Amino acid sequence: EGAFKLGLIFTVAPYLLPKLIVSLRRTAPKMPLMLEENYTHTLTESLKRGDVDAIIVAEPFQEPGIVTEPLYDEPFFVIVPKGHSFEELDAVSPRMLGEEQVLLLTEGNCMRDQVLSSCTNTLQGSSINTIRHMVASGLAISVLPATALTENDHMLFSIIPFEGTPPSRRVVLAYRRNFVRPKALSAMKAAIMQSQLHGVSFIC
Amino acid sequence: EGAFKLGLIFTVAPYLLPKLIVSLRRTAPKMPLMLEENYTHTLTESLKRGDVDAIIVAEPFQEPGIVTEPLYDEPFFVIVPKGHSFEELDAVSPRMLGEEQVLLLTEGNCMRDQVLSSCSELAAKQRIQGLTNTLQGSSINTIRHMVASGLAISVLPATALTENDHMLFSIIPFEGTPPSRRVVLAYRRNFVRPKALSAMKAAIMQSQLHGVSFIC
Ligand SMILES: [Cl-]
Ligand SMILES: [Cl-]
């Protein structure tokens, strides 16, 4: 088979891919990947031009001539520096975060909106990588997507769940209505679905 | 506010930060960090305007009124899909990867040139149709996953190599003298906080990062 071109948003790509490759070898053993990571907007534009075959992005997503399929829901968690007061709380986070310094990802990341919608000087990182290590060092607190949280990273900060129903995002596969590789696409949505990504609720 | 503003290149930040954060809690346990990851040239401009207190970059680096202090050398390794011929090879990779499809980082990554300048059978392809025809990924993240998917082979910095990703591709050593990069600390020459600086170099030197040789 010949290369599928897949684009994933920044806040998803580094976490989904490792598992997508493994389950892709089950579902499309002979199909190489050509991979793009980028902002939703530049990703939509590139898919519209057929520069890229399918992209993984998140609600809200609506675009003429483009089809999306649900993949999974991914809950958010609050992270805080070691010794932050929320360390005493079980899963006590609603919008008690109005009184805290919160790092939000830069504009262009759909993750700024989805946390903002849950609850100039606004402390802000360009990425999860810089945001998690800023928090680790005590600069402030943030909100991360479940799949961005290493089992092994309670050494760096503390993950404090939201209470009740956590804010979450819906990750989806977007592709052109007129796309003409039905087998590659279908093989792709199955690798993702059989991927075994931790921390999410697959949509079935 | 006690906050030290530190910038690091893309191909360094994700691998050094976690350890650095841990060393830093011994050597400046009250110094919070503002961080930026970016391309070298972007980073230098920020250092110069004082938006950032210091930056982590690699050789070659020379800039007027900027000082650098070496931190470590970091070898490169070839990575190849599962089942690639290089897999039964010894540590055989000289530059006989002029014969292979070689993924390389996009323009703005100093790692593009370091990989190039090592080999030359590879600069040839760039001389050809290069710099857009070239087979490239903007990040080590997309590259590692194209190599693992089947797409091609590549050359990676040691500290990017998960001791537990033999699942995805195969790490092939360069024979004899591995090509390497030199990671260094750069700051303006008359920075007012020599103590902040010195705790940074200290925390990095003691970070215990794997696969590098520290420069003492
Ligand atoms: Cl990120
Ligand atoms: Cl540069």
Author numbering:
A (entry chain B): 90 to 208, 221 to 305
B (entry chain A): 90 to 305
Sentences from the paper on this structure:
In N. meningitidis, expression of catalase, which is responsible for detoxifying hydrogen peroxide, is controlled by OxyR, a redox responsive LysR-type regulator. OxyR responds directly to intracellular hydrogen peroxide through the reversible formation of a disulphide bond between C199 and C208 in the regulatory domain of the protein. OxyR, widely known as a mediator of hydrogen peroxide-induced gene expression, is a redox-sensitive LysR-type transcription factor. Increased cellular hydrogen peroxide levels result in the oxidation of a pair of conserved cysteine residues present in the regulatory domain of OxyR which leads in turn to the activation of transcription.
The structure of the regulatory domain of N. meningitidis OxyR represents the first determined for a wildtype OxyR protein in its reduced form. The N. meningitidis RD-OxyR structure was determined to a resolution of 2.4 Å by multiple wavelength anomalous dispersion method using a selenomethionine-substituted protein. As expected from the requirement for TCEP during crystallization, the protein was in the reduced form with no disulphide between C199 and C208. The asymmetric unit contained a dimer arranged in the classical head-to-tail orientation, typical for regulatory domain structures of LysR transcription factors which was first observed in the structure of the regulatory domain of E. coli CysB. Each OxyR chain comprises two sub-domains, RD-I (residues 90-162 and 270-306) and RD-II (residues 163-269) which contains the redox centre (C199 and C208). The two redox sensitive cysteines (measured from the γS of C199 and C208, chain A) are separated by 18.4 Å and are located either end of helix α3 (C199-S207). Chain B is missing 20 residues in total (residues 88-89, 209-221 and 307) largely from RD-II. By contrast, the side-chains of C208 are pointing in different directions in the two structures, with C208 buried in neisserial OxyR with an ASA of 5 Å2 compared to 109 Å2 for the surface exposed C208 in E. coli OxyR. The overlay with reduced OxyR shows that the helices, α3 and α4 which are located either side of C208 would contribute to the dimer-dimer interface in this model of OxyR. Therefore, the formation of the C199-C208 disulphide bridge which involves a disruption of the α3 helix would be expected to alter the dimer-dimer interface and hence the quaternary structure of the OxyR tetramer.
